[PDB]
């Protein structure tokens, strides 16, 4: 289960925040992909192709598939799990894309939430991955994106049929249930106020109401030196302890890492639970030229970065997305 | 306001943490006090003196009085808030140890909760509480002491009469009401189970229940690299958001920093709500010799640190405790 | 705000329960209407007409409009307030019916939930009443009906467009919000269980979850001597104290009366808060012949009935429904 | 289990009600006892005797011992449950008044809480608790007494030591834990406000909070016709559903009947969960003369009544209290 929230500050101040929780280690890493690069939405299926128009920084999943990142044009994307997401019924002859690269496609071809919604509602392809290949627990997610202007759009495939809700009023997103209900739930908690009562359980829906109430009670300021820690605080509030385990639940999904993107100033921020220090990357201080080279920022070996870990950027081989089932 | 809890792990692993919530800036700092330092419990009233037994690292608040820290013997003490507090009735005439140095006196002259339990129950000195009318809240608090053995003790002068609670079970504590109630109220939610319901509200009791439930659920492991993060994680959870304001409730005490101690290894980790990195100080690499010098680690000007901030210490003169209500801002 | 719940007992055991709460006195009464009677869906508007096919007993509203009742064929109807119910936008040339008689129409022309749904989805008319005529607080409701078989159908007009949900799994109904959300809310409370935690507030949505969990934990028995009090208990649980008043809320809507219908055995049950005793009426012990006469069962003057208040039935003039705005 | 609360209205209006929840049938009944009836606090142990001062209407449980009632002086007493109860420590040798007649002895020999407060604090007699191993829960309860003046008192033998709480504020009481905690826990929800949140759960504390909040919100009126229904309304609210069963929690104590008293007018209203009408008995129309005769109003066979059930009383012999653990069913 994961959550993501977006802050709408004065003077185009847009800062997004995404959570990462998983049962075991995620082995995620940060890769930087300049523009002018082509990719295939799938390797063993009929698929579409494109050409990376913008550079961006994203967080990987075991070095297999992107699930969060921010592009040059202050636009951030995030994939959160949704236990009731189906992408297509039989009879789909469209170019089958794979859920592993769904994220990467959008960031490489979009810079404004408006434009992204347009091409998506064409359903020009079906994006899928086989079920429980590695005996995994679940394998179904939904994505959220936001531009440096403050507009956001939640996307979910309802048993094959896409389901999208666009607008700036929608700035938080958890796992389950369906958003229309996920939001309807909050209607009840808002009347009971947040101060006089606030549910502290860890269920997917519970994490939603908390973020909603706090992300508004936060100070309405356009400055960037303060909003960043403010966004992370609620991320820490919504974040859950690591290594939890009760008699009923033998193993649990713990808070592994979180991400925040200063979409107004184009600065991505990333933190790991088992790390003491906080680092960041300034996209404006990054050469996304067509021929700049792929520099990786590894985190598996437990490296400890901090500050502007741009000097620590090392040229590395872009992780190969996985559409097979092994 | 704040919230404190203690973790009890195998292999003598006992990690304690603390939270700090304030409506404005605390302007806290950090100072070092080698052993063998005489001190007076007050500058103008009849109070005892002493010479620091064990060197102690303490975190200051406004550079007037220590609010939390440690000493040379895995003895971590913290001072939280409590409105319904009364230290003495009209007529008390004992030595009135100012509240500003009460904690420091403890860390200085104690290394085990059992000892402090004794010297405390002697009821030798009163507690001096200054009163101020211009934007100042009267001093009404309580304290908690934990030993590297894992034994904890709660102290609170309830309506002029002090009540102490010792034991290893007693590991969590928050603002109000009195622990006699807070502990029992929590037992209610215990029935409900944390997985199913938990008062996520920022209120005192709400935080107490959440900390109590999670502190057990966290991993019980003897390794420090794992238990420490598992601790601060609940610290951030119990910690309320930063700078919350509502039209009805305009100002609210917001979190300003968190403190964690590895009493099993004598380490102190510190982070601020406005400081991204997490620095620490290895007490073992310290020298508390009587003539080692008072060392300060300023933070008023917003200095930034990370890792082990041993090299970045600068000797300075001891701060000045506050025993009498300030005349004005 | 009002609530209604339906019990599905073994061997076609169907018993419905409806709540009544209002700010001040309701001045309601119980009228019996045999079959073979004609009515007009509105007096000053183009309207449809029919001929009462079955007899039934209903509870009136100030002696102006029916809001609850049970027919011969063990089918019960109930109108509950819904603050977000609109019945038609401009351009409605259909026979305008009035919200006051909407209830009476269904009971007089239906005996099975299936048949009722059919004719309703024709939208052959618009049923409306002018807004705040007597300075009233609100004036928008939704209806729930159930046959002696156990099938129920909730109905709500979404800004003119009807909204219906049919099935036996839907046996409880409160005021707000919309049902699709009103039910989605319960999804959260069911996971938290009812025993280990149950919200006791009085808001419309809160009253829903309580009834849902209890109406299932109740014993699954086909006997009728016990299920009746069981249904009323939750009605008492969902029922709220009378004359409540805090500093914030100066006057409140108190629990005035409740109703339960033994749809399997065709027996209607009614209780008033300010009355000590409980009475009932056995439809099977009632002559709904075309020419039987209208016998009223008054309750305004605070009469105190009990037991089988059929002997207390007195021939009276059927209350005239109100479509005007005075 | 059960739950009790007291309403305080102007013009000396004080209406008290009670709830009864049991896993099976209580087989309760009703009996009348005119004044001037000698009684012994036990049949086989050393116990005091007495002669009933004030006639008292009591509701029996299994026709063995009174669980609630009243006397000739607007003095309504009730007996609720409490697991963590201890009446005396090993070695007590005082008069051991059986728990079955403790209540009756009170109503018989008292007319004001102040008096009972005195005679009770004398600590003259112990409490006899029988122990049974076959489907029987050991007797562990507490009591509450209210006077027509509106003053209430809570009594509970906590770990062999009795603790009393008197006053007009103390009007609500439930199962567990001890009122010292139950009262304070409720103060928590008080913060949350009843309109915004209320633990609708059937648990002991949940019911206590709901009753406390609503009992104030109900109409404060001097007329009986209005206050009485406003009372029983909260009684039904606090009352848990009937015959609840879950696969995990199979059997649960369900509500069986509710009792209300108009202490200002000396009336007793009674209803059963399986009885639709609400009958009552006007104590004023009663004769408790010493030789008036013990009168019973049976309910085992499920008789049905309504209105004022004065005419439908049938004289019978007094029931038999239980002082010793029954040999078997
Ligand atoms: C959140 C919680 O905000 C995003 C979570 C995403 C990154 C993960 C849930 C995801 C998609 C990553 C990869 C794994 C997914 C499934 O659990 C199936 C596999 C499980 C295996 O343990 C690792 C690789 C898979 C593909 C997983 C939910
Ligand atoms: C429930 C709560 O289950 C059914 C409630 C129905 C019977 C009432 C809400 C209703 C329709 C009855 C009549 C009155 C309605 C409005 O409040 C507008 C008027 C108010 C006035 O005080 C009495 C007559 C009106 C038509 C009312 C909601």
From TrEMBL, chains B, D:
SUPFAM superfamilies on file: N-terminal nucleophile aminohydrolases (Ntn hydrolases)
Domain spans labelled Choloylglycine hydrolase/NAAA C-terminal: 2-287
GO MF: hydrolase activity
Keywords from the UniProt entry: Hydrolase, Signal
UniProt record similarity statement: Belongs to the peptidase C59 family.
Name of the protein described by the UniProt record: Linear amide C-N hydrolase
Gene3D superfamilies found in the cross-reference section: Penicillin V Acylase, Chain A
Domain of life from the UniProt record: Bacteria
């Amino acid at each position: 289960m994961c959550t993501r929230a977006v802050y709408l500050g004065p003077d185009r101040m847009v800062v997004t925040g995404r959570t990462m929780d998983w049962k075991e280690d995620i082995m995620s890493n940060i890769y930087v992909f300049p523009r002018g690069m082509q990719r295939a939405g799938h390797n063993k299926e009929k698929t579409v192709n494109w050409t990376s128009k913008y550079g961006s920084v994203i967080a990987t999943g075991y070095d297999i598939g992107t699930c969060d990142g921010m592009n040059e044009k202050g636009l951030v994307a995030s994939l959160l799990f949704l236990p009731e997401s189906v992408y297509s019924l039989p009879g789909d002859t469209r170019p089958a894309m794979g859920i592993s690269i769904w994220t990467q496609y959008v960031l490489d071809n979009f810079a404004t939430v408006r434009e992204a919604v347009d091409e998506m509602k064409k359903e020009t392809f079906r994006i899928d991955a086989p079920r429980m290949p590695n005996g995994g627990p679940e394998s179904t997610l939904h994505m959220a994106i936001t531009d440096e202007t403050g507009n956001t759009a939640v996307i979910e495939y309802l048993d094959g049929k896409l389901s999208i809700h666009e607008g700036k009023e929608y700035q938080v997103m958890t796992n389950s249930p369906r958003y229309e209900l996920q939001l309807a739930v909050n209607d009840y908690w808002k009347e009971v106020g947040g101060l006089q009562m606030l549910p502290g359980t860890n269920r997917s829906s519970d994490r939603f109401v908390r973020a909603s109430f706090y992300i508004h009670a936060i100070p309405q300021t356009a400055d960037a030196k303060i909003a960043v820690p403010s966004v992370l605080s609620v991320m820490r509030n919504v974040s859950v302890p690591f290594g939890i385990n009760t008699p009923e639940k033998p193993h649990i999904s713990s808070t592994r890492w979180r991400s925040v993107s200063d979409q107004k100033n184009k600065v991505y921020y990333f933190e790991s639970t088992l790390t003491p220090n906080l680092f960041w990357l300034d996209l404006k201080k990054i050469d996304f030229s067509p021929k700049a080279g792929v520099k990786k920022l590894s985190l598996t070996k437990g490296e400890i970065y901090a500050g502007d870990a741009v000097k620590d950027l090392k040229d590395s081989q872009s992780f190969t997305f996985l559409f097979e089932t092994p």
